[PDB]
Amino acid sequence: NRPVALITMATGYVGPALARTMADRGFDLVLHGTAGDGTMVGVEESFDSQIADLAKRGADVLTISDVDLTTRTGNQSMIERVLERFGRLDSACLVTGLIVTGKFLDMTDDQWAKVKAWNLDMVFHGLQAVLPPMVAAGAGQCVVFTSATGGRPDPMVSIYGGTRAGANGIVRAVGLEHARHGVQVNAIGTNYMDFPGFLKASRADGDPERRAMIEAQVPLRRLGTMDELSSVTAGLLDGSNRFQTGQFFDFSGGWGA
Amino acid sequence: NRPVALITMATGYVGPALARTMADRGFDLVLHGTAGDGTMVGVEESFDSQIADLAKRGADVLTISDVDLTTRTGNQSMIERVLERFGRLDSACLVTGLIVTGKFLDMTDDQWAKVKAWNLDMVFHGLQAVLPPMVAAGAGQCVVFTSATGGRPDPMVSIYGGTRAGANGIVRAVGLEHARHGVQVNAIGTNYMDFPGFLKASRADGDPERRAMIEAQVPLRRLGTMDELSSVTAGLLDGSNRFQTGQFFDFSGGWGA
Amino acid sequence: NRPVALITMATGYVGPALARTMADRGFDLVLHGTAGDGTMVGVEESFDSQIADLAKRGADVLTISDVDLTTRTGNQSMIERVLERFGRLDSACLVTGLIVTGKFLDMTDDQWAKVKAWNLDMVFHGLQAVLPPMVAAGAGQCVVFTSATGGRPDPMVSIYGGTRAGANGIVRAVGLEHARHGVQVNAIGTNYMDFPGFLKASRADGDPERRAMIEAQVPLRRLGTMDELSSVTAGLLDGSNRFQTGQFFDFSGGWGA
Amino acid sequence: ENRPVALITMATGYVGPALARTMADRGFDLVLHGTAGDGTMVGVEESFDSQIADLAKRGADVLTISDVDLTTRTGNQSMIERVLERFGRLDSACLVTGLIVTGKFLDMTDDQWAKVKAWNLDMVFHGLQAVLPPMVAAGAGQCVVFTSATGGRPDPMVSIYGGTRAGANGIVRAVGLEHARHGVQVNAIGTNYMDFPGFLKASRADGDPERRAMIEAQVPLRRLGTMDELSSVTAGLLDGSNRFQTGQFFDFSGGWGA
Predict the structure, then answer these.
(1) Structural domain boundaries of chain A?
(2) Which residues contact residue D250 at a Cβ distance below 8 angstroms, ignoring those fewer than 6 apart?
(3) Which of B175, B220, B240 sits opposite C245 (nearest CB)?
(4) How many Cβ atoms are within 10 Å of D33's Cβ, its own excluded?
(5) Do the chains contact at B158 and A165, CB–CB below 8 Å?
(6) Three-state secondary structure readout of D73-108
(7) Contact between A173 and B167 using a beta-carbon 8 Å cutoff
(8) Which residue of B has its CA nearest to C251?
């Protein structure tokens, strides 16, 4: 009678570390991500490499990689495939968004459209899919990953930070609206995290001297670890804390405080 | 050498009262709005009605009513016709949005698409159209109307309140990004205002019993008047205050405090 | 039968400019401040120089300068003397606080005691004195000046900015608690204002070298003027806007956005 | 053999006992400040004697303190001195503060005003001035200050209590950001609607099922929080597993403060 957790974009970012700790905590897993080995773009840990490790921890695993999570059909199909394999959905970690920066007056209609599809549509369709089975069960926990820029939309990041703020707003209303059914929905927004996504976007991957300058912008003078982020994320998904919902938690070393 | 102020949706809501006071402060006016007389939907004070009154106050008027302000082409066309008649743009008041409410799980793709086009696209394209001339002149003031729900997006107002929070987010980044050019951009969000839009949406029109119940939800126990709102709004557009930018102001009788 | 406005610390900061425009708007005035001519510390415009100008604007004036506004007795006696002369109290502007900075671990018990007395006690006793007559009249407007550091208490400003935040919190509850009696209470917090107080605290006197460094810290690249602040302050005290209460407005050229 | 040390105040009630139990499971030695006496004394939910026995089976040494005034500089300085004398190190500190008062704003007296400042602010000011120097000198430390969820939404009938709580949160933000460069963290947690005697009697929900249900109906998640839950979240900010958050305030009230 093991509980089931869903994690998306799990071939990178916090997915791999989160899966390990959720398996240690007694969960079966459903991992959505990119197919192929490490050479393919956006693949930090392939499906194959993870399955061996997670099985030793005692978790059954299902993989999904042929859905478009910016649409209703992609998210509905993902949850349908979850329920037929395991027949339940206790927790869900929805990783969303795509980074874009630049002057506000240089932004194009394509950039504006891409920001809306990844920062808002993924959240809207994602939540409309995971909530029904949780409401029907009378219990559930969801974490939506947005961005720390949503708490302080700054110049040169207007359309990206601005839409992240709207995503946090949606999570507040949704987390409050379904609380009476025993369901929790919260948001986490990170920045200055140590992984390829942030390193490339901040032009820090090339020069170690530029890395040090970027670290000097964080109050705690370092970049975050995925093991740290997974421990925090799991705390909102493992059933140990059922008294927080509709809230946004900043995770950027004090940058967003 | 009168300055020029642009007001959109000016055939209703705050437009008419704002135009009158702005004319008293020595402004020329460009009014976007809806064509037709009082019997057509969405018109509270027709163009013809305001022309005669605005004339005695000493202001010239240009009307625009054949443009789609959810598009880039529409907003660009609007500003081109402003610069053509008067050759300058000193202040801009952009009214945006369209209300939708209901359970989060009942929302359709059409509702989701409609709220994005009115609450976000109007803001994106609107600002990309009014700023370039202000930056060129080295001075400008802009007010974007969003909604008090952006400050506290609640159950039954998930997608409307959440996207309003994103609009406020964009206005913060933009307001701070163009401040060094002497331009100001701020947002105002209202609720419980006495005008047809809110009265119908709350099912309070023609129902004195319902009206009293609605007013009892407001800390100050009343509905707001357009004369009050126009005075506050004109204060951010008449040149008297030039030390605020990128900020959001709640105007709901304490409801959003 | 003119209305009566009360203004404290009125021999400096926003007092004199606020009294001038409030008189233009038809108010009788009661001014609390420091006695003496420009020689004494903390007096920018003496009582004598002002009463002649304000009388030409058509207002009666009452002066008070022998009360300790960190105590219940001082504030109670101030309002008692106001009702004795005019029998009426319509608006009140309570200027509070005294600035302290430095490392948190270098703060002494006297510094801690002083920030509490000027940032908090003044607000507690001030509001307990002005509200009773406004409640009994069924109408009233109050503005409490705190500081923009209350919105973002930063390092080296711990106990000052921290206590300013507590003052804003008190204004929120009080502003919401008495809204049903037709009374309004809001707060304004400034920074980077052009007046002797702020200039001395930032070592920017007759030294354009550092004042240019200070001005670059503001998004709008300038310092605010009391005529600007006076216009915003008067808007919340002249009866033109009765739909905002329990709110905090930042006025630092975008520094606090 | 080289166990880290954690300080917990007001540990005879509220979250102290449960937090002590899990921090011991995670390998900490403990210094517990609290009230002397058994369960018959007011303010003692779990007595010192009863905790030392259970904490012992978990492999933790314990020091107790109950003769200091934590509203003063002398009390807090004395407390930290006795920590370093016994263990020679301070790794984590959980400072419980404050005292409840409610009622109409215009009915508040000078004694009530003086009381909230001493418990909601002075405890925080003097508390942090005593726990930080050891952590800065070592280059590592974690601190949690318990304030109140009302600090995030100071409401009518809670003016001076909620307002001063918002001030404590502001102080925690500046301090948390000011010492981040030294490798030290300071954050705040603010609760409401917790299942323990302090809240049950302040809300008159004790012994009355119907009133207990009406109180729960004010919580979005329609329940009261347990100390096991709160101690799990609190320990996660004091056990070295998360070192990337500082100067922040976290609401813990079932969504009430969201």
Answers:
(1) 1-257
(2) A249, D187, D188, D189, D190, D233
(3) B220
(4) 25
(5) no
(6) HHHHHHHHHHHHHHHCCCCEEEEECCCCCCCCHHHC
(7) no
(8) B244
